[PDB]
Amino acid sequence: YEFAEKILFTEEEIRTRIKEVAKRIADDYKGKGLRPYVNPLVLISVLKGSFMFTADLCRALCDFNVPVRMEFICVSSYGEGLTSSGQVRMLLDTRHSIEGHHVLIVEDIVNTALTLNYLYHMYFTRRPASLKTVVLLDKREGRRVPFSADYVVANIPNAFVIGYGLDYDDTYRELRDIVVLRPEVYAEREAARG
Amino acid sequence: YEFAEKILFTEEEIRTRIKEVAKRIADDYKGKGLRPYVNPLVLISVLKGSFMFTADLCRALCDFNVPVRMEFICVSSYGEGLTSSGQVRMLLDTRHSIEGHHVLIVEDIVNTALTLNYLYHMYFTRRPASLKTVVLLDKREGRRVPFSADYVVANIPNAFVIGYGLDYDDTYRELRDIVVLRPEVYAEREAA
């Protein structure tokens, strides 16, 4: 990747970590007696960024016999830039009611946590049986609001990361690895954009 | 897989076919001069079924250095027996305009092709540079309206298949493989 400063996690590392977290999730939910049709774990995938993680996580969960029902919502905040707008837009909400169901919000990364804070609050008031969160990446110090995810695959330093669903101006979401974008590359783009 | 009548494709066979299709798409787009930011291949992923296929496909395309821009759309129905033409309600459309862009609609299964034909024609009227479709599975004999997909991963007979994004009553999308749901199970649950 000529545009990368470095590779944080390779595809293999990501796959391995996701498998461990799926195992934890399975153990933790065993007492809930999850069942297809009548009692699945509702996964609320936060588009666009969570699409890849979601695709890989649900298959990992299936390996541990955890029945799931997928819901995709769309939330926007960074747009084409490199920093939070501070405003969270709900472009698409869930199809069905989560009231009375076990729900797990799946996100690719938590930084300022304005997005998850918005989400968690919204769904919390809908009275699900339980509500948890699993984030692929956590920038633990970038917080603007306090938020503690129930499951974190990896903690990362403050640098703009791309790949595996994460984008910079809706570019690079398709990479198999998670890499750090060189500032020279985004600075040249930013200049061209604004 | 107690609920399954038989295994159609394993994760490994699926994985291989997708790479083969991605190689072809990549060659066909070579003349299009695709570039990130300005001229990426826009993939219009039709939720919810194509979520898994899309994640593996964009990675295979990345393997071939094809720059992509991911778009996800969500469609719904107006009601029962309201349209002939496969008209659907757009709940979520593309974030950015497709006019002047090379677009590829990603779907996981085409059978009657009613809604896919409607969607194809809709984006066609928005003037993209080019418009194509890639479908994971094609039930060639089920057409209710003439429709041909530009790339297809596999042709299959008329059997209800589940797994790899495909569901029966929002169940089984998470399977790594594509299997045939026991007809009895489908019949009972459908009537239920």
Ligand SMILES: O=P(O)(O)OC[C@H]1O[C@H](OP(=O)(O)OP(=O)(O)O)[C@H](O)[C@@H]1O
């Ligand atoms: O914790 P926060 O600072 O809120 O940042 C994290 C959120 O920001 C990103 O989404 P973005 O707004 O870029 O949308 P996208 O998923 O479509 O890329 C990322 O995918 C998370 O959803």
Ligand SMILES: O=P(O)(O)OC[C@H]1O[C@H](OP(=O)(O)OP(=O)(O)O)[C@H](O)[C@@H]1O
């Ligand atoms: O041509 P037919 O056999 O009548 O069915 C056509 C559509 O039905 C399914 O989508 P669905 O409504 O199931 O959406 P989904 O992707 O969210 O499951 C299937 O995935 C096709 O796209």
Ligand SMILES: Oc1ncnc2cn[nH]c12
């Ligand atoms: O490093 C990063 N990459 C992609 N999206 C975001 C949001 N916050 N921080 C990000």
Ligand SMILES: Oc1ncnc2cn[nH]c12
């Ligand atoms: O076999 C099949 N499996 C899942 N969804 C659909 C739609 N049409 N045909 C299907």
Ligand SMILES: [Mg+2]
């Ligand atoms: Mg996001």
Ligand SMILES: [Mg+2]
């Ligand atoms: Mg983003």
Ligand SMILES: [Mg+2]
């Ligand atoms: Mg379906």
